[model samples]
Target chain A: LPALKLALEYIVPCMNKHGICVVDDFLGKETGQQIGDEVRALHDTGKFTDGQLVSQKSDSSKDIRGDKITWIEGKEPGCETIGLLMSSMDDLIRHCNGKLGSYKINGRTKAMVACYPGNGTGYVRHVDNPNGDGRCVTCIYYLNKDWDAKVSGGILRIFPEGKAQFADIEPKFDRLLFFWSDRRNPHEVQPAYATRYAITVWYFDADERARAKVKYLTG
Target chain B: ELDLETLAPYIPMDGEDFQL
Candidate 1:
């Protein structure tokens, strides 16, 4: 049903106005469930590793964030669905860059499939690209099936720029959220009582990357 | 070209920011 086209029309305009946008069923509930299962399977294999900060340091104590993430680019076994998602996202980014004009987005970092195991696991509030790193747009898709916002507790709370009050977004299944990666959006993941799964991709602006004077040189 | 007022009607003007 012209998925990308539909997403583009709403995402761009919404981002321009609100500095953020949430698209439901960006792919489909079934695709989201498939990805959720895939991520769980891979995670069970002990492939998922500790999450790192932009500083390239690991907390080890889960103080800043209590999630494990694995990066995927494309064309890998056991990650075929992620590859499909990546391809569609790439096309969406290309169209966004052309239409947005202000964003010179030319690259996308590897997608990250992350799982926050319950037990009060959540990320502290922070801005994604405060130091640049070329990340101009932050996009995340949730794979948490039958998520209960009232009790499961993994809401993405965001502080919109120039707004006095913040907004809380539920990690509903098949939900796609996008926003500026810099100071325009300061967000955090609230503690969860149940496991939460999501995949995130950041689109980079070439000029912004070139202008960045410093970055976390660590791998 | 972009109008934040018209685009985001849900944001309010008076409220304390949420903290950790």
Candidate 2:
């Protein structure tokens, strides 16, 4: 579908309108299917968490976010998806560094495999830097094939603020959702009506200690 | 065993120096 053209059109408008970008056809069917298979295979191996949130460690966190996540280690057990995903980010990463000099020259990227089951539970509105993780960009790639919107509770909700209006991004297969981790742009995942899978990647500006030291650069 | 100094390298100061 020559869909790289679609991804290219998303950058500036996103930077100006909402600081968040949504792009579908992020990957072709074959590549996306293979990646989906690998991700699903690793589901059982992922470390379970109550959304992997750093601050919400209390009993209430369970109600706040209904998902367990596993951080993909180096190599990720021979999944080409990891490498493919990496190549996709190079351009965007450079764009961020160039447009916003705030990014650390040698900034790091982290990815987590997350799943939410069909139930009335979801993540409450929250920012990504609560624990000072210093995450500036969050890219979520959906792996569900032929997914339906009505039966899927795993939708991403972006609130309206900072010139950014509300947006609901469905976790459709091969669809990638990119959002800046600004204080003004708070977000959360809706409760799932069906099982959902996603690869969530975060690009950081600095480490926790470094972020704490630099108040302005902090998320 | 993973070292105490190597517990989940969170430091942005040249920690592991990895990307993507």
Candidate 3:
């Protein structure tokens, strides 16, 4: 109740005003640590698929991105914390639609956990849903505990609407990032010297889904 | 897919300024 309330307080307002927001310690340090360890374990065991750029035509070029990912169903053996997070997000969405402005976000894409193997792994700047894939709100949870801003890279850079220069946001531990998935915000992940981990979920706008002609895959 | 050319607003065109 309190977490979603706090999330809604800043996330909705910041997104409405600036198209972006960053919430630190959204889920406590312990949760972040556990998720980090869990995801890294799966990654080490070679359970993730290579990242791809799914556009009008698919591309797996390293020039675009160098990361591996696995989708989460929220019911896996060691995903108890993730499940809790997802459910809380569900409540946040419901609250946004019910009490907040007419956001019309009703559907959600599968959550994906990504591991960007260090040593210059990063992604190009791009909008999340330029082709109208129904993604309205993009949320990412970072699990890099004890992260060093100077040492480890993989910084998230965002070009906010009407802003001349972009903002570089460190993927700090328990940092929950929120932004509109449309063209208003173009973002990229910078190269990492040490492995970086994050999980993301896209909230879909009901109207966008009803009107979209292209049901593209989430990046 | 919607016309890829229309993505110019979101994606920077070749030699275009970074501030879209």
Query: lDDT per residue, candidate 1, A1-219, as tens digits?
Result: 365675578878888888888888878877777788788887899877667665433324367778888877667798888877877777776667655538877776678888888888998777777755566788888888889979999999999989878879899998888888877888889999898888888876777765552322321
Winning candidate number (lDDT): 1
Candidate 2: misplaced stretches above 4 Å?
A1-9, A45-49, A100-105, A130-132, A162-164, A206-209, A213-219, B1-17
lDDT per residue, candidate 2, A1-219, as tens digits?
A: 333444455554575457777778777788889887777777755555545444323345465567766666436665667557655654555554545324563455556677787676677777655445566666788888977877766778888574435888888888877776655567778888887888876666765435554653454
For every model shown, what is its TM-score relative to the native structure? 0.84, 0.77, 0.84
Off by over 4 Å in 3: A56-59, A98-102, A213-219, B1-20
TM-score of chain A of 3: 0.90
Supply every candidate's count of residue pairs whose N, Cα or C atoms clash at under 3 angstroms: 0, 3, 0
Model 1 ranges off by over 4 Å: A1-4, A56-61, A213-219, B1-20
* Model 1 docking grade: incorrect
lDDT by residue (A68-119, candidate 3, tens digit) is: 7887767888777777677766666666774334557776766678888898
Point out the higher-scoring one by lDDT: 1 or 2.
1
Name the top DockQ candidate. Answer: 2
Q: In candidate 2, which residue pairs get closer than 3 Å at backbone N, Cα or C atoms, i.e. clash?
A: A153-A192, A153-A193, A207-B12
